[model samples]
Structures are given as structure tokens and as C-alpha cells.
Target: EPLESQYQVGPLLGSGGFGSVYSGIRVSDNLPVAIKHVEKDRISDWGELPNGTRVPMEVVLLKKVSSGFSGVIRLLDWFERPDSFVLILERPEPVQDLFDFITERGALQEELARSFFWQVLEAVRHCHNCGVLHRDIKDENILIDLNRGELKLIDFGSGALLKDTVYTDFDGTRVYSPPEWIRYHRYHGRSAAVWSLGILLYDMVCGDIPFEHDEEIIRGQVFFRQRVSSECQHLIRWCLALRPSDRPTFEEIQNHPWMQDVLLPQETAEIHLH
Candidate 1:
């Protein structure tokens, strides 16, 4: 369906240096969607698929990662404009991003956080298997699907194809990046993803990331502000190891006691947005 006649754009949801997204609906089924606008010049790189069809990097990764649907975001459709491009994204209702979810609930209980972390880990592994790296795996990019008590990864805007070689430039949040990304400005997608996983878990249980500045990040030091279980704390430390080689692989992380020790199917707390 033609975007102009198929969807109705609503108010702005949010925006940043990257671009803006507006609330929207699919006219045929009233399917909620996020309409994202990006100026042509703003694209950092144009990537290609197996057949060599060139597209935006986000589009490339989204296409690669869509096959799994393991709690990752979905791309509905897209259109090219005279001066810009528009991306149509699936918008699940009754969902709140982790950023809002945590702040509203205060620090999440360990059992609840563990449940959500499992979903995140599943998606991350699936993405890796699909050869896509969600470089920016932060709270703001994770949406909790209240209807099913699942976590969905959104905004592949900072994503790229996973590769074995070093990536010289970074496109995601610097705060979520590993120390190696700061010192050497080079990292493999796998190592970087491991680091962000630690940051994500820490944020959920501790109410914030372990480090904010380059100095703090370089040392990989983390002091919990909340009463986190020792196993969970150890897992976070393992993921946040200073050297990329030291961080546990996704398999190792899953086998870690904290992940295996998860005990309850905690009910989804009342979720809402003001």
C-alpha cells in the first residue's frame, strides 16, 4: 500500500539528532505504527544485502534480524521522499520502554529483572545468529510488552551487520560502549554487545549504569547502589570485564548462576505512561 494513502501520521512521539518519529496508524487495520523521518544527508552509510540492493544501515540490519522475531522490533514498510526517507515501524500497544518502566517502578526486583533479562538475552543471541549487531542496547531502546510480559528491542538506528573484523567507528551511545571503544576506537560487534548487556542488567537492578565517564569506564569498576544478589552482581562484573576477551560469551552468560537461578514468573507490574 502506498504510504501517503495507507497511513495517517499523528503527533510527534520524540526526536533527536538522528531523526524524528511520529505516532501513526495503518488505515486499513488501524495498526499502530511509528513513522520515522530521516534527512538524506544524515545517513552515515548505505549498506547492501546479499543481492547487492543498497539501503540504509538500519534497514539492512532490520531486514537481517526480522526472521527471528525474538522480541526484536519489526519494520513494516518504508518510503523515499524527495529530500528524506521514512521508515514505518510496528508499534505494540500497552508497552512502556525500560527507561520509563524502571523509573516508574523504581528499581526492579531481581526476580522481575531476571525474567526480562532472559528475553533480552534471547533476542541478542538471535540477532547475533542473524549477523546483526544492535549496537545500542540501552533501556530507552527496550520496550516491555505488558500484554505478554516480554521485552522487545527497538530502534536499530544505531545497528550494523555483525562481523569478525574490528569496527573503527561507533554509532551508538558512548556511555553504553565498552572501554576499548573509547581507548582504541575499535571493537568487534560481539564484544561490544557483551558489554552493553552488562550495562543493561546493571541499569535495571541498580537504577543506573555502572560508569558514566571515560575514566570510570576504562577501569570497569562497578559498585552497586542497591542490594543485588551476589550471583547477579558477579554476572554483571563478568560481562563488564575491562578486556573484551574476559567478558563471557552469550552461552557462558546463560550458564552463569544468576541466569540459571532465576526463580519466579513475576507478574507484570501495572504499566503506564504519564
Candidate 2:
């Protein structure tokens, strides 16, 4: 559809520095869609590598990984122009992000958390097995498809392949990033994904971030680890360790006690925003 047509663009669903995600539809099919529109002149400023590329790696990885993650997101269509890239995606029903869900609803009870965590770990496990790394893995990036009773992973802009050493000026979401990224390491995968998962789990456990900021995060990760439940704290410490060799694989995470046949309801006592 053209930028301005008779059909209404409708209200925006989400927005970021490069572009905004708006609810739209195909005039012909009348099917619902979420169109992510990027400005032409801002292409270089949008993605990374400093040399100026749109960073459409997600398109490649998603298509490869789509079969296993059919419910995550449907790759509708896309258009590329000199100034911008228009990505048409299946619009998921609006729901609170996992991050907010944890805050307001409280942590995922024992059983529910394990199920959801398994889904996340499975996705990562599949990616890792296929030589892919979801460089970004925060609660916000973990979209909820409540209708399907599923959690979908989104935003692969910063994702990379295993063993690829290409460097880029672009970093990932600040809160979910690993210390190596701050150190400007070309790439840190196996352990990085594990660490992000740890952070994700940390939030779900105490509804709080274990490490405060970049500096504090580095210190916490380097030295004294936060003490919580043995199942919770031990896993967090292992994944958050400064050395890659110290972290466990997705397989190990799957077998943890916290993730074992969870025994509690998923909902929490408080309320949070997406």
C-alpha cells in the first residue's frame, strides 16, 4: 500500500528511534498487518556496521528458523527502496511484555516459569544448534501471543551467526547486553546468550535486576554474585560469570530445578506495564 491512501493508517502500536510499528491492512486482502516503516535518509543511521547496511539478517535467520517457530511471527512481506525498508509482519495481539508481566503479575509461578523458560531455551537451543545466536534476549524482545498461549521472540537486528567475527558499530538493547559488548568485543555468543537468559530469569525470580548499571553489572558479574535461592542464584552466577568456559549450555539450563516440572501458578501479586 502507498504511504497515503484512502484506507486509514490506524493508530501506532509501538515506536523506536529508527521507525514506528503501525497497525495497517492490505487494501486488497483487507488482512491485518503491522508495517514497520523506515525513513529513506535514515537507512544508514538505522542499522549498524558504520558502512551502512539495513541489517536484514533477521529475515534470513527467521526464514530458516520459521518452521520451528511458526507461532513466533509470520514473515508477511517486505519492500526495499533507496531510502527505507518496509517490513510487513503479522500483527500480534497487544499484551504486556514479559518484563512488565513479571513486575505487575509477580514472577512466573514455578511450573509456568519452567514451561515458558523451556520455550525460550528451545528457541535458543535450535538457533545455537544451527549456528545462530540471538544476540538480544530480553523480556521486552520476548513478545507474548496470549491467544495462542505462546511466547514469541522478536527483534533480530543485533543477532549474529556462530563463528562469524564481523564487527559493527551497532550494539544491542542496553539492559540485556553482556559486558563483552560494552568492552567492544567483536562477538561473544555461546556465553552471551546464556548471560542474557540469566538476566531474563533474574527478573522473573525477584522482579528485580541483579546488576544495576554497566559499571555495577561488570563488577557484580566479575566478583561477588547475588545470593538468592540455590536454584536461582547458582544458575544466575554460572551464566553471569565473566568467563565463557564457566557458563552452561541451553541443555544444562533446561535441566535446572527452577525449570523442572514447575509447581506454582504463573501469575504474580503486583501489576506491571509493557
Candidate 3:
């Protein structure tokens, strides 16, 4: 595959049963890249390439959302290797994931949380717009540039095509999952998405998620550990509704009182316009 002439894979950044990502370099342009290697057997589906070859479903989903938005990690290049599939991705420098970011900084201020939240929602929405559903949405999946304050959503290995009907199958973090999925084994795409965002927002502003146990989630008891605006608390509760039918959709989420005053990420395109 001439892998050496294209890019060189370096040390692994992280790993799980699904796949692993490694530090990498593009020899032609010297651009830093993330080399993600997926086990050939782990692919849930296949996407046909323009040249009549095939790749994992993750690559197809990555190309879909990142094609028009910066919310998802951009796929620079990909190849089907004998042992596994290698995906070259755009790597952000001096970055920290929200999970580690929260651990280091403690609870974030309301406005700061809102600013990051705005971008995340936009990114997730962009995924739906691209006909992809990021089945997994969590703090660890969100990466932030140090002082630049830009955010990029990573990891599409748990993703699937977007659907309007409730799913009979599920592949997402339990803590972020809604009660319907926990008890009924069924959930709508947007309904469960709102639930995860609730946990994410709570984790960001309150220093942790409201529920660590399934009982807590089923009981729908959201206890705030830190003080925040009433609107913020309200939005969290709304998303964590025990009844899936009662939860707010993405559109309703933005219409909520709290998100109305939420700050958004900077429009970096203005710099180039200058």
C-alpha cells in the first residue's frame, strides 16, 4: 500500500476493543495526522470507495459530517491494509479532551460551558443533517484546542445511519443513555441524543454527571452539586426526562430558556477575511 511513502504511524494515543489511534505524519506535506487502525472484523458495515474498493463504515460517516462542518474530525486519507484498515485523520495540536479538561480545571463557568455547548450541539446537529447519528456522545469524545477555544468531535466507530424511528439495537455509554434504552431496549435517535447532551452539559458545568447509577437515572433525580443558573438546571432536567416521549428534541433544546443566552464559538473565518 506504500504506507511509508504516504504517512508513518507513530505511538498509539489510546485503544479499546473497537480500534486504536496513533500519532502520525504526512511525508509529503509534513502535516501532523492521527492514524486510526480499525480491526477488519470489527466493521459493522462497508462503504464502497470511488475506485471500486471498500472501507469501514466509520470512514463513510467521517466523510459525511466533516465534509461541510468542523465539528467532526476530518478524514485526510484512508487505506485498507491487510491486517486492518488505516484512517489518516486531521489532528488538532495542543488539545485536551473535555474529560481531562474538566478534571484539571474543575467545574466550568456557566458562560464557558455554554460556549462549548453551542459548538457541540451544532456539531451533533451537523451529523444528523449529514444523515449520520453519532450513537456515542460523551466528554471523552469531545476535544478542545488549548487557548484557541475551538472544539472538534472525534471517534465515529460507534456511529450509524440516522433514523427517525426508535432503534431496536443500541451501542452507547450506559451512563449517558436514557431510561428508555436502559429499561425498554429501544430509543429514538434524537431522544437519546438529548439525554447524552444532558449528561455532557451537567458534567461540564457541575463537575460531574447527575447520575452514576442506573437507579439514579431511572428515578430521574438530578441533584446539582454546584450552583448554576436556574435556566441551566432547567435544561438539564428537561433532557433527562424519564419518559422518552417527554424529552426535548434538538430544536426544542435550542429554544430552551438557557440556550437562548448561550455564547457560541468564535468565527475564525473572520481572521482570513481581514
The best candidate in terms of TM-score: 1
Off by over 4 Å in 2: 1-8, 26-31, 44-55, 129-131, 164-170, 184-186, 221-228, 262-274
Q: How close is candidate 2 to the true structure, as a TM-score?
A: 0.77
lDDT of 2 by residue, 1-274 (tens): 5544522366787777536778887666677777777766544323332365454565555555556453355557666766667777766665446777776666555445555667778767776766666777888777665544466676665666566454444456676667666666543577778888887777766666667688866665532233346676677777787666678877788776666763222231112111
> What is the C-alpha RMSD, rounded to one decimal, of candidate 1?
2.4
Residue 150, candidate 2: C-alpha displacement in angstroms: 0.6
Candidate 3, after superposition: displacement of residue 229 in Å? 1.5
lDDT of 1 by residue, 163-200 (tens): 89999988799889999999998898887899999999
Q: If both were scored by lDDT, which would come out higher, candidate 1 or candidate 3?
A: 1
Tens-digit lDDT string for candidate 3 (1-274)? 4777888778888988557889888988888899888889877778765576687878888878768567888888778778789888988777778899889878887777877888899989999998999988999899886546677898888788898877988777889988888888888888889899999999989988788888888898888999988999999899888877888888888888788765435532122101
TM-score, model 3 to reference: 0.91
Give each prediction's root-mean-square deviation over alpha carbons: 2.4, 5.3, 3.4
TM-score, cand. 1: 0.93
TM-score of each: 0.93, 0.77, 0.91
Top lDDT hit: 1
Candidate numbers sorted by lDDT from highest down: 1, 3, 2
